[PDB]
Amino acid sequence: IASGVIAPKAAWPWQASLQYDNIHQCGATLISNTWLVTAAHCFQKYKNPHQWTVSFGTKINPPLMKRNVRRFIIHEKYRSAAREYDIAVVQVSSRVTFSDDIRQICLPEASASFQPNLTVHITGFGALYYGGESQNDLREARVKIISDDVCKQPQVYGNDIKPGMFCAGYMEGIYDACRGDAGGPLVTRDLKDTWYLIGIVSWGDNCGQKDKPGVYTQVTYYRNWIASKTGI
């Protein structure tokens, strides 16, 4: 998370780290006691379910309830050469037990809407600037959803924004996702104090630069996919 602040214990209990050979590659987020959601590009190069692990809490290096990946499922239409269809699910070989630190997030119904000046949160153990290293401590940032129209300016991102993608950040930059944050959550809280998964950190030019916000996979667009694959 660019210019990201340290997240408190138990603030984002659905947040997970995905490690390949005990190195952090990517975020995920919990949706059941067995299943997580993340990006497809996380498994671009590292394709062995059995060398992936998952851990929770605010801290990688002293790992919480580390777990082994039974399997992962990537979107049929994802292709490493393009940015569309960037979603995957991950099932863990042992169910995990919900504490104050570890809990499942809610998924939105397929047709929920999110007014495009809405305040949303974004978290991950990724880099603090472009080309920086991952942190062992989870970080957060408050950004805002951004109109597809704004976003689809040729000055911004143009025709690279395809269905199932949306933007979030600030046109003034500073706060953003960075490398190591992909597959991790973009969330909001309804007025009944319940948190919901709206986005999955996907891509972007640099980190925290004017007119270069993050691009997220749009959960509501892939909501039926997730259901078919998880039963959630």
Partner: peptide, 13 residues
């Protein structure tokens, strides 16, 4: 329950 956090958003300074 899903989507519940037990720590406030409103933090001590």
């Amino acid at each position: 329950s899903c989507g519940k956090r037990v720590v406030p958003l409103n933090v001590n300074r």
